[PDB]
Structure formats: structure tokens, C-alpha cells
Amino acid sequence: GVFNYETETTSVIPAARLFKAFILDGDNLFPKVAPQAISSVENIEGNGGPGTIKKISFPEGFPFKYVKDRVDEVDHTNFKYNYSVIEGGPIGDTLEKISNEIKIVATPDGGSILKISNKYHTKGDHEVKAEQVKASKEMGETLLRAVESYLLAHSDAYN
């Protein structure tokens, strides 16, 4: 029916600060920290709440130029942020709909832990290969990896 993948990551940066930048600055921080993944991100409708649509652009040399993204619901109190896409380059009506969920948690034992889950939906005639998911998993870590470097970049600032 549907494939469900879950990944776990840890970051010394606090979830409160990473949540605001990851959410409020997730559109700019995304490309700013990793411009090689998305050339630019635009918000079609919504202001970060549920039912918000955001357009994602991609640099030349990729499979699709841009992809449509939709947000399911974001909980500021639970620092939980999930989003799904209905229209994508390699995705049609439902050949490979992707729905990922993001959760941020703060912990004085090892900083804040991020939890990202990936879900693949296929009409049925087409199936998804596990290897294809592995490649997407690495990209997901590259997104949070560039964000962590952004927080450490402040140290390079004079003050």
C-alpha cells in the first residue's frame, strides 16, 4: 500500500532557535544553507499554517525544474512540522506521492533531536525501489546538515 520510512538526527543547536529558523526561515534557510538542492522557494498560498502551498524551484541539472509542496499542519507547541506534496516531477496523480513529517525536540543531554519520516504513495501499477528511498534519505540529512552549519556560521561573524 504505502511505504513508511523514519530517520533520526541530533543537533546541539536548541530546537527553539532551530524551530523558528527551520520554520520561519525554513523557506530561506533551506536554499541559503543548501542552494544546490533548491534554487529558490516561494509560498503559493498560506502563511506557514495547515493547507499552505509552497512552490520549490530546482537548479539546472536536475530531473524536474520545480515541485509543488503542501503543508499538512504545524504545531508550534509540539514543534512538530509535517508537509506533503501532491504534484511533483517524478510524481503524477499518485504514482509516487511523497509525504514527510518533521518533529523538533530540545534536550539538555545532547541538544535537540530532529525526527523526520518519509512516506511514498503509489497508484499501484508503479512501485518504488528501496534504493531510490536511500538516495532521498541522504538528501534529507543534507538539508538538516546545512542548517546546523548555518548556526555555527554565526561564530564566523565578528560579533
100 known member of a binding site: yes
Q: Is 120 annotated as a binding residue?
A: no
Q: Is 150 annotated as a binding residue?
A: no
The grid coordinates listed for 43 are 509560498
User: Does 81 belong to an annotated binding site?
Assistant: yes
Buried b / exposed e over 92-129, threshold 16 CB at 10 Å, is: eeebbbbbbbbbbebeeeebbbbebbbbbbbeeeeebe
List, as residue ranges, the binding site for brassinolide.
54, 81, 83, 100
Binding-site positions: 54, 81, 83, 100
